[PDB]
Write a protein that binds this ligand. Sequence first.
Ligand SMILES: Nc1ncccc1-c1nc2ccc(-c3ccccc3)nc2n1-c1ccc(CNCCc2ccc(C=O)c(O)c2)cc1
Length: 388
Amino acid sequence: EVSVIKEGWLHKRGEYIKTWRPRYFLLKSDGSFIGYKERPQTLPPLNNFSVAECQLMKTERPRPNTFVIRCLQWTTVIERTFHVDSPDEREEWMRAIQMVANSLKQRAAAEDKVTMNDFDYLKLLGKGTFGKVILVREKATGRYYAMKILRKEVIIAHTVTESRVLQNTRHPFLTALKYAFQTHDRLCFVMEYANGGELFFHLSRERVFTEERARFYGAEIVSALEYLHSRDVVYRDIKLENLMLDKDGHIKITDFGLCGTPEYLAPEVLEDNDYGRAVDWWGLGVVMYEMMCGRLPFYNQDHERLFELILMEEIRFPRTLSPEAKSLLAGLLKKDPKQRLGGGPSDAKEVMEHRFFLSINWQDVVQKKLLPPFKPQVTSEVDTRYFD
Ligand SMILES: Nc1ncccc1-c1nc2ccc(-c3ccccc3)nc2n1-c1ccc(CNCCc2ccc(C=O)c(O)c2)cc1
């Protein structure tokens, strides 16, 4: 019986637009902590909103009586920042959230060699607030991986956190975890790294993909998004720079984020609304628009003007785009998430059934039986041709 444990107004700092907005939050016994524009028994809340295993901290900047929920979601640290009027209300909120996180931990328990000197460290792939990602070579074998390194003091404040190597994604087009280990100071996630080049690189040179090429990539992404949504997980990071090709030409969605790019923000995410699975279909629409038209659907140097277009401007197309493509993209880029293709109760099913994908056998997709339309110029998984 899923019950509200605490509800009320909070000042929530925007996740991208760093601004404070009052929102009405419900902390529920299933661990979800979700905020609404007004005070609204429901379908599966997304794990993105869960307080399970989170760490709570008090701070007085930029305002007194601020608190932060910090969670390790898979391999990524997520932070949500809140503000209340008085230190008593902050305490009551933090104690209730911690209570729910304690209950969930108890329920989960009731229901259910490798070191840093084993790698060469070759190139920094990215760096964020909480950790970094480095291209490494495993010394014992010569294979290449991306190592995400995070400081322990961030979400431990921990051998149990090595159990991600079990809840590991099996999906062919997601990034799998090879090793997870800890040092005295840090946690290290060694994940696969595709050596077929960044899709941003391939699209930049080819200028524009044929519709058949974009359909192949889009279908692999749809299959990956179905898998994540079936686990109650939203990716929220779909963009060209998070898509790579493996040695055979299949998609790999990267898991390299660290605590954005405004041109990909869905309308409901700009207004700090309750967003859901529909934000991933918006993102698919933007990257498939990029692949088939060679440019972004909404762009402006002035971010105030960009937001207007994303919120307000109707999407326009080149007339050489097939009608099936114009229809897919207009459906994926509907402003209202409830009217968006894939935003309904069947989720990915609505997208998979669109006429643009009529030729796709979705079991061939997930079984990697579709012949890639482009084969990267690498002959093995250790060919470093694309590493610069
Ligand atoms: N292994 C994979 N390879 C490729 C893609 C996805 C996975 C994967 N596998 C997964 C397995 C599990 C859970 C999981 C999720 C939630 C709770 C518990 C578990 N997530 C899993 N993802 C996964 C989901 C989301 C991301 C990226 N998020 C960025 C979020 C953010 C927050 C704040 C801001 C602010 O600005 C921002 O910009 C972006 C990466 C991987």
